[PDB]
Nucleic acid binder design. Structure first.
Ligand SMILES: [Mg+2]
Ligand SMILES: [Mg+2]
Ligand SMILES: [Mg+2]
Ligand SMILES: [Mg+2]
Ligand SMILES: [Mg+2]
Ligand SMILES: [Mg+2]
Lengths: 223, 149, 77
RNA sequence: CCAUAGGUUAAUGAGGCGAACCGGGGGAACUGAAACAUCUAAGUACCCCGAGGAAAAGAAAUCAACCGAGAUUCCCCCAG
RNA sequence: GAUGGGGUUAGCGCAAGCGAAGCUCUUGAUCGAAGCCCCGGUAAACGGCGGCCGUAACUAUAACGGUCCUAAGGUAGCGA
RNA sequence: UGAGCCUUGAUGUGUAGGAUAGGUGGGAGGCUUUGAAGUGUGGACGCCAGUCUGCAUGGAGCCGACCUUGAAAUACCACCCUUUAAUGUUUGAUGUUCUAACGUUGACCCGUAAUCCGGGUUGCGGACAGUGUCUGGUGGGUAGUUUGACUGGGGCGGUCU
RNA sequence: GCUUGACUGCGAGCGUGACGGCGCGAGCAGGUGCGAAAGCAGGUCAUAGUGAUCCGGUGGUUCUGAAUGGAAGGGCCAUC
RNA sequence: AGGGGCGUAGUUCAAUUGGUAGAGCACCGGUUUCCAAAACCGGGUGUUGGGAGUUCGAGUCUCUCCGCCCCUGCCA
């Protein structure tokens, strides 16, 4: 049934047992077996379940190491914030024209940032940006008066996360070619932000399991 | 309830095998039927003492076995004669009776049973290679020279 | 009577309580059982009225040792 | 089958009585609480067992508090 | 006795504080029968056997019912 | 025969549609004589639409990839979620085959001038029954009590701040 | 229209109750609000909208901490 | 208190279990026969207790706002 490519992947990783961060990151570097450069895919299970409305978590984190995942930033803002956004390196800055370009189907951006005054225009794009999860939300810091900082903070390696229905976290710390030590710092910085996001009523281990995997790599548990 | 086996009760093992077992089991079955005894400090030392006693017994019976062995192994060739057997046709055989006395030479007594004569009943005249079994593991060796009357 | 021949346990009295702590007099009796103990020296079975706690001490102390103490008290068998 | 149970003798000892006191095994209710359940009365009355002129207890796995005391019993305080 | 929370302190810390191991206080996952809930039966088991409305060739009455409560509303016989 | 997890397999129709398109990322890939597509029933299930791959056969093809679509696909993976199925791990639940505890108000022998008792022999039952501790339920069977006052006597009615 | 005085510590002197208690209070201290200010504000036009103590719960607190350091527990404050 | 539970057309009770609330009888009509009654249809009857989330979209899942429940439980 399984081909030789798939069988060697599961031969390299024995996921039936847990592994320590030091060993886990070593395994991740040896799992990079693809024609194209891969990106680490986080597989963290939370004991808390989003089936309770108040237990939902939305957060953001800027990573110094970065991820490489495309970061084209479209900015909805007016006035001095538009110049500050351009000076901060925003690829697209506009309001109604850029919204109408989006309505015309020009979607050459990966991240939308909006000023609170621009929320009126971005709200009209809710049918387009909403299902794709690109809609700016204050809880992730993408709706801010300090538009230049949001453009900055993003660019490099700002990553977003939103809990699913099964209470699982599927983020990305960065590319696979990143150094093991940097990747460990990357996930560690992510982990502390999750602890802050944790509520209180949740009478369960915040994380049900921490695992890491690449594009075609197997899941190695982290301890 | 530690108890020292006296036989091969079921799967518990065999004679002389301390094993942990539920109290009731021994409290009313092994002991009143005599199949075992508690392996208590006092009893266990007596047990091990009897064990070592029989062990040294085996040592001696095998130590004295090598004694008889060497006594007769190293050369100790015999040349006793009896009937009118000569050369060519040695005529008669030498069997459990005369052979035992021969190797014994009024000393190294080896039972007539052990006189394992492999090459038939040694009818031809000449050099003959005869072994003895003083003990089950001891493989003794003797050379017998047959001479005419 | 309900007296253990090994440990000497006998009925004792206490109170039945309740959620209102009402106290009514009661009796606590030992977990006595008539058992036939195998005495090796006489190769015989001797029946004793023993408590469940008494059964535990018989294994620890030995069948002969416990009987020796009973003979000091002095009784029939 | 030995044995054991059992049986027959012979030696000793115990039996019962007696006031309170003492130790132990059991152990109320009336009453008080202005009723009444917890509680009180009370481990009292009473019953049973055992002992003595006394009994019981008794020679620290005790107290103290960083200083020390040195078995048990009894009295006065501590203290309502 | 799963898990979680406290207390204590080896240690680390200028100290703020943190906290190993151990002991300890607690929280009570899991297991858990009858019973109860539930499903039937049983009245020579304890027991129960009402109202409302309409309807006969005159009236009347209501068999012929219908309706509600109820579980179901008194038969034979007897009856100031 | 239970209830568990562990792993694996399988399972994911409101619809548009590629339609047996869980959940969420990763993901432009995918992908591979090592059985390319295929071709033949291994298919069993299922919506009977479809799905996974006895294995044999053939030898590089295979496929992210529009549109609608939540929507982009059992093409891509961690591995999980549901439906679960098997597999590994644990307590129990009965049934049975036992005897050795225990029971015998079965038979026989002795103590023994004995329908008691004890011992022995044997049979039957048997890890039950029965008993102890703890515990749920039931329990006028038996106890200890309560069951107010004002009031043109009391009760009834009414009243009590 | 603006606001939180429905303020905190107190309180001269009175009222009404057998008492437990209840009620009124200028003024003082600290911080407020509204006014430009004088000033007003310690809930509501007033008089009903309520329940003592014990016990337990919660927060705060250098008060206590049964050898000592803690802690438990207790006390005090807030409060159920 | 704590753990299970339920509140859909005037009459009750099904469901869906995110995509989609019927039947019951009462009522008015229509059929059916020579005609009546019985039967057979049409149809007029709904916010799935209520409120807010979650959602592309939920009477459905969740949080609950409650009423009415069954089990179970506690010393102002
Ligand atoms: Mg009284
Ligand atoms: Mg005297
Ligand atoms: Mg008359
Ligand atoms: Mg009384
Ligand atoms: Mg009166
Ligand atoms: Mg006003």
């Amino acid at each position: 049934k399984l081909t030789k490519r798939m069988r060697v992947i599961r031969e390299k990783v024995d996921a039936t047992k847990q592994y320590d961060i030091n060993e886990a990151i070593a395994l991740l570097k040896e799992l990079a077996t693809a024609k194209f450069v891969e990106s680490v895919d986080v597989a963290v299970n939370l004991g808390i379940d989003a089936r309770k409305s108040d237990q939902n978590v939305r957060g953001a984190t800027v990573l110094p190491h970065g991820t490489g995942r495309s970061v084209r930033v479209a900015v909805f803002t007016q006035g001095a914030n538009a110049e500050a956004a351009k000076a901060a390196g925003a690829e697209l800055v506009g309001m109604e024209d850029l919204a109408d370009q989006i309505k015309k189907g020009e979607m050459n951006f990966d991240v939308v940032i909006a000023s609170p005054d621009a929320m009126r225009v971005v709200g009209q794009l809710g049918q387009v940006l909403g299902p794709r999860g690109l809609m700016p939300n204050p809880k992730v810091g993408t709706v801010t008066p300090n538009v230049a900082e949001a453009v900055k903070n993003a660019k490099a390696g700002q990553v977003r996360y939103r809990n699913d229905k099964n209470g699982i976290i599927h983020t990305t710390i960065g590319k696979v070619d990143f150094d093991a030590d940097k990747l460990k710092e990357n996930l560690e910085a992510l982990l502390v932000a999750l602890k802050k996001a944790k509520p209180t009523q949740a009478k369960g281990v915040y994380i049900k399991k921490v695992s890491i995997s690449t594009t075609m790599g197997a899941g190695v548990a982290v301890d | 309830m530690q108890v020292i086996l006296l036989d091969k009760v079921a799967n518990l093992g065999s004679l002389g095998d301390q094993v942990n077992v539920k109290a009731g089991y021994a409290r009313n079955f092994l002991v009143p039927q005599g199949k075992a005894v508690p392996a208590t400090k006092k009893n266990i030392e007596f047990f091990e003492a009897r064990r070592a006693e029989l062990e040294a017994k085996l040592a001696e019976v095998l130590a004295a076995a090598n004694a008889r062995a060497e006594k007769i192994n190293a050369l100790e060739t015999v040349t006793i004669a009896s009937k009118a057997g000569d050369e060519g046709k040695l005529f008669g055989s030498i069997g459990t009776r005369d052979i035992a006395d021969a190797v014994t030479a009024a000393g190294v007594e080896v039972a007539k049973s052990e006189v394992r004569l492999p090459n038939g009943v040694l009818r031809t005249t000449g050099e003959h290679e005869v072994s003895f079994q003083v003990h089950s593991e001891v493989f003794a060796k003797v050379i017998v020279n047959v001479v005419a009357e | 009577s309900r007296v253990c021949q090994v440990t000497g346990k006998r009925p004792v009295t206490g109170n039945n309580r309740s959620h209102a702590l009402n106290a009514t007099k009661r009796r606590f009796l030992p977990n006595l059982h008539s058992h036939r103990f195998w005495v090796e020296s006489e190769k015989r079975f001797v029946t004793l009225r023993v408590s469940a706690k008494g059964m535990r001490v018989i294994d620890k102390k030995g069948i002969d040792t416990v009987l020796a103490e009973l003979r000091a008290r002095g009784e029939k068998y």
